[PDB]
Amino acid sequence: TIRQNYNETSEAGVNKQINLELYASYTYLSMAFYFDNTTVALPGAHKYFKKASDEEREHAMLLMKFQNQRGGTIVLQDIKKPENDSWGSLKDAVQAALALEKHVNQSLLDLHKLADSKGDAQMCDWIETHFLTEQVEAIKELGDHITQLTRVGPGLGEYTYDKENLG
Amino acid sequence: TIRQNYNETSEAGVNKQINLELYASYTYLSMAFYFDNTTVALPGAHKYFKKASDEEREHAMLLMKFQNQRGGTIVLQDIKKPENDSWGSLKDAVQAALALEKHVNQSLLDLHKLADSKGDAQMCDWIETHFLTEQVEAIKELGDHITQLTRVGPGLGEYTYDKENLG
Amino acid sequence: TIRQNYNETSEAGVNKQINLELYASYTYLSMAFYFDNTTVALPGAHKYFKKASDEEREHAMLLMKFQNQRGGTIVLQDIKKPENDSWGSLKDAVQAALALEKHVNQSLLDLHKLADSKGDAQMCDWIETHFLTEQVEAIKELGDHITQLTRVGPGLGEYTYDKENLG
Amino acid sequence: TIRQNYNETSEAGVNKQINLELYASYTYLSMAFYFDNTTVALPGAHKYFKKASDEEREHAMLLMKFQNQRGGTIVLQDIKKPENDSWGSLKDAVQAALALEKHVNQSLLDLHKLADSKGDAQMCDWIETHFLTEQVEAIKELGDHITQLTRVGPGLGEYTYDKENLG
Amino acid sequence: TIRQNYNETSEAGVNKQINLELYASYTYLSMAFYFDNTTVALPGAHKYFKKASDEEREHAMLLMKFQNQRGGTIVLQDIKKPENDSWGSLKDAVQAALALEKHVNQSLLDLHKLADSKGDAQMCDWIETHFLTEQVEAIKELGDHITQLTRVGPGLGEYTYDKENLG
Amino acid sequence: TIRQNYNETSEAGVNKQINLELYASYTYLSMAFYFDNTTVALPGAHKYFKKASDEEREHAMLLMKFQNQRGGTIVLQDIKKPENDSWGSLKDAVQAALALEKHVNQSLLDLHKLADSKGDAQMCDWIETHFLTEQVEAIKELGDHITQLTRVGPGLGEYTYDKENLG
Amino acid sequence: TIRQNYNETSEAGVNKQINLELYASYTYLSMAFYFDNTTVALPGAHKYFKKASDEEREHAMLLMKFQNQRGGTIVLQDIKKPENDSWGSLKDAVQAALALEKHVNQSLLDLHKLADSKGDAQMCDWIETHFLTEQVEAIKELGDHITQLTRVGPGLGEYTYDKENLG
């Protein structure tokens, strides 16, 4: 028996977070191959969102590893398909990415609060170490991308930011 | 318009195969982190099924690429959770993997037969090139693993085959 | 006598394909040096279409090699001059290239169907191996170029895509 | 006067933890040389617990350094002899190691909770940075070893795990 | 049970092809050591047909591997001795080699047609990948050797071609 | 909008800490060039406090970065001149440095307590990660320097400690 | 307007020479793959005439470049198929090559005389620099090959000269 100071509600919250990271991974996968579609043809955004999809899947696997380390049980659920089939302009897709990452961030802060209320000091620091600052940096980066995509405008500007920044 | 000799039924079959490969990826992820649970503790199988998950996700992404190359439209669906939460012995899990890969193979052979019925010579060769022989080799490897896992037996044999072969 | 399972209609079709690959080579040669003309002055497109002309000539020579390998007789015909003397905007030229490659692709699929109907298993696989997937990738690339050339627009955008992508 | 925001109960708790880490070091030293005894003769376990003894002495020294950093005073007490003179089977010893590390983990969580109740933000973070996650990983590793030692069984299994994993 | 979409007539055909490849290996071994005989003394042909014998044994082993991969059973038969004890001139032996490889090519095309009639897409592709184009190239090479051996003529020509081309 | 879980009082406290770190930077610059004055002439202390000034300016810039990352607004104020024009003995200056760093530490602990009262888990961890332990180590080092400067005494000792330790 | 001292008759003569060089390229391609036919089987001549084809295509492209550099307009015409389908002996083919190169040389000398009659000093030097001496050296080499092919004779000599000189 390795389980120690690990509440069953914290365990359920970790299972929930696993599914949300997988959901995010699959949303970015959808975004990546939308930009690979020949009617869209933005190869930098294809690469950028494919990497984001890999990173979110890494996040899901960090949480599954944590679930095992603390002596919980991983319980998987369906991965819901992304909210959209097509994602509009490059700026639209980055705006939807920012919305998703803020939603993931709120869920991580709720998970942290839950852990804190059960006195789970190791879990709180683990979430801070691997997630909370990473999420703040990702949100800042996407916000910067949105301001730049606004500045450069549609057409030539979108092509340029795709190739010179996202690629 | 890049689409040429690409049937709408073939396109839908590719979208079905994308979902099936993702389901396989998620089943192997489940298996991998089952073997990371402290009550199972088989690190070779954890590494082996984690790589199998990565490979099936690559398979899904090859099909997404092909969908775009031929001028179809990727349509994603929910990724259903794996059939089990826990996977029993190492032999049980390899047996479950064999059954899944044979299911995926029958799906690929049906997709090949469909593409052939619509005269899609490039699609047929593409499935042969990337999938049909890879699948036969995967099934042969899994069957060999099952025979070796039967030979070495439970207990010390399972530990040994996990570490010396799968890891 | 090396000839075996090689139908005389398949042989005629290979001679036809040789001439069409040479025709394509000469159309891309025309395109390349149109963009070298001082009133056009797009050096990236000059390079890009000169390479395409070399590649189509390589294709013609692969087919002549195949004709000899199977024991047929190469019969050459006039290479018709390209359809146009000048090719308009960079987007116009890439659109004409896409139209030509789809026409070449349809001819390759007809050649494959002909071979299949005569039971020429080696010829079918040879066409799949060297041509059918290459043609799908070339058609996808040109379609992507057209979407990007539309996105970036005339003037500065055309200059930029010429230098940063086609060059 | 460097002392700042450092409670004297926190300071007394750090002194208690120093003694517990030294007690753990000395328990693992006992175990290590039990496995070096000719009637036991498990060289992998000897090396593994010798390293564990070194690491626990490092932990004690980290806490002594921290006591000095915060302007407290180190106060040493007798290091109690280990609970047993001989440690049974390899599995028996890893089970006693797991019990000990859970006791040390509970002590660390109590020390953290004490620091938190006195508003010692830096001491809380220091315990998280150096101990809490290290302790969770050590406990998971020991649990995994117990599961594998059960799987391989006595005799040849014990010999094999000792040589191939612990050593 | 790894067997899937593998017809027992296909399996019996693979066993037949194994024996034919072994028969070809043994014919080329005969030829190779005929040219090593002191009354013949053509060292280039000795090396060339020894290599051909090795390659045909490799072909047999590829087919045995395939039989196992698809879940069939290898069934071996006597390897018949070669049709002749001595092989005449160098040109004579290359002519007999050409006749043999055309017979093997017809066997491979029949095996492919059989697999195709049972819907064995993977077996058809496997034969194309490993045999059909290799066989066309081997036949072209042998035909070219016969033409050059005719051109150089008997005596000094035979000596020269043996040393400079076959060797 | 990137701002999430970032309280306006926390934001104002970060602007206060930016100014305080800049004040510390400027105090250390004053000290550094006091020790460069020909009537003082302690080159080790000049180098030591110049680096301390660089480090506190880096601290201010880390907080400016954090303000932007969380979606706050940097608001700068006057940097007040240091408390003294001349700093007495080397021991006097290290004593003045210790008092300043303890003041900065109390400011950081108050900022941490404020962020904690508003549930800002990421800010709390960020202050722990970048400041709280760095501050404890800085205070410990300064206290040690003061004890050594007392031990070595004025005159030759001050010269020696300046050159051999601070420089 | 870059055009200067470039006569319209000279421009038309350059367009005529572009077509003639392309006709030569295609004649050499025909010859090259005649020698690759299994009933001819001379690999040195295949390589030699394939390179000659590449070189004449380079010649055409040099003239296209020159047309653009001087501010003319490239106008392409049909490339007539070669005069023969089969080229007889190796000596016959080199003899046909010599006659073609002398025809091309007379065309170049006529183009030079025309440029000279219009006072086009740069064009005259350009034809001298790139063509007139290259042509004399090509004709000398072909004449030497014909004398050597006469010396070595049919049969073994033709094989030897093909391999040792042309290849």
Residue numbers in the entry:
A (entry chain B), B (entry chain H), C (entry chain B), D (entry chain A), E (entry chain A), F (entry chain H), ...: 3 to 169
Anything the authors wrote about it?
Ferritin is the main iron storage protein in most living organisms, playing a key role in iron homeostasis and detoxification. Canonical ferritin is composed of 24 subunits, which self-assemble into a quasi-spherical nanocage with an outer diameter of ~12 nm and an interior diameter of ~8 nm. Ferritin has prominent octahedral 4-3-2 symmetry, and each ferritin molecule contains 24 C3–C4 interfaces, 12 C2 interfaces, 8 C3 interfaces, and 6 C4 interfaces, which provide several potential pathways for metal ions and small organic molecules to diffuse into its inner cavity. Thereafter, we introduced a self-assembling strategy by designing π–π stacking interactions at the shared protein interfaces involved in two different kinds of 3D protein nanocage superlattices, which is referred to as key protein interface redesign (KPIR).
